[PDB]
Design a protein around this nucleic acid. Structure first.
Ligand SMILES: [Mg+2]
Length: 210
DNA sequence: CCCGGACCTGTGACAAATTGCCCTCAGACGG
DNA sequence: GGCCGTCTGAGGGCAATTTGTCACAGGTCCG
C-alpha cells in the first residue's frame, strides 16, 4: 500500500483537521511528492481505498472540502492557509484543488514515514496525530520511546479547551487514543505519567511492532 | 487542633457532534 | 444514429455512539 512520507515540520505543526480532511491530506502529500500545487481527487478511487460506498465517499469529500475554508497551519512562528482558491468540480466524480504553493517545501525536506494501511482504520483524528508523532521516532525494527510535554501536546494537536482539566484529558483523549492504536494498528503501545509536585507535565510513550 | 481555601483526582449528566446506514433520482456511458 | 438499462454519485434524511462541558464528592497541605 502507499508509503506516506512527510517533513517532520508537518508532523509537529499546529492544526485542526478531521479524519476525512486528514485522509485527503495524505493523498495530496502522495500526489505532490510523486513529481504548482494543483491536485485532483476521484470519488470512485477514494471509495475503493477506504472501503466506503461512492455515495458516502462523495459526502465525505464534499463536506471536508468546504470545511477547509479559513483553516490555517502554524509552524514554530509563521501561519499559513491550506487553500488559496475554492475547490471546484470540472467533471462528475472529480474534484480539483489548489494547495498553497508555499506549503510544498514543508511537505518535502529529518523525515517521518508509515504505510497507509496502518492508519486507515483509525477514527479519532487526535489519535491519528499521535500515531504520526510516534512514527517520527520509530526504529527500523519497529520499536521506540519518547517523552512529549503536555502543554505542547495541547498546542500542537489543538485539543479543545476543556481537556486542560487533566481527568477529562485522561478520560476523553488519552485512554481512547491509546485504545484505538492497540486495536486498529499493528503497534503495541504503553505509557506512564511524569509528574512534578502535584502537576503531571509529560507523557512517556513506549512501543513495539507486532 | 481544626477551619476555608487553593490545589488535585474520578465520575455522573447533559449537549453538541460524528459515525456508518438508508432512500431518490438524474448524469455519463455503452450496448 | 439514438433510446434505454445500468453503474455512478449528488442530494436529502435517521438512530446509535463518540466527543466536549461542567456540577459535585472527596483526597492533600498551608498558614
Ligand atoms: Mg462518512
Amino acid at each position: 500500500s502507499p508509503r506516506i512520507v512527510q517533513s517532520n515540520d508537518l508532523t509537529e505543526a499546529a492544526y485542526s483537521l478531521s479524519r476525512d480532511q486528514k485522509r485527503m491530506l495524505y493523498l495530496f502529500v502522495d500526489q505532490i511528492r510523486k513529481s504548482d500545487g494543483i491536485c485532483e481527487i476521484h470519488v470512485a478511487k477514494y471509495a475503493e481505498i477506504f472501503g466506503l460506498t461512492s455515495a458516502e465517499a462523495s459526502k465525505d469529500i464534499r463536506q471536508a472540502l468546504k470545511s477547509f475554508a479559513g483553516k490555517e497551519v502554524v509552524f514554530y512562528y509563521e501561519s499559513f492557509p491550506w487553500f488559496i482558491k475554492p475547490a471546484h468540480s470540472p467533471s462528475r466524480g472529480l474534484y480539483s484543488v489548489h494547495i498553497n504553493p508555499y506549503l510544498i517545501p514543508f511537505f518535502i525536506g529529518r523525515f517521518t514515514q508509515f504505510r497507509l494501511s496502518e492508519t486507515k482504520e483509525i477514527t479519532n483524528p487526535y489519535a491519528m496525530r499521535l500515531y504520526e508523532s510516534l512514527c517520527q521516532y520509530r526504529k527500523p525494527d519497529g520499536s521506540g520511546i519518547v517523552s512529549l510535554k503536555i502543554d505542547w501536546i495541547i498546542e500542537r494537536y489543538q485539543l479543545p479547551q476543556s481537556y486542560q482539566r487533566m481527568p477529562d484529558f485522561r478520560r476523553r483523549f488519552l485512554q481512547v487514543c491509546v485504545n484505538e492504536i492497540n486495536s486498529r494498528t499493528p503497534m503495541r503501545l504503553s505509557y506512564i505519567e511524569k509528574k512534578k509536585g502535584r502537576q503531571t507535565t509529560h507523557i512517556v510513550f513506549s512501543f513495539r511492532d507486532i
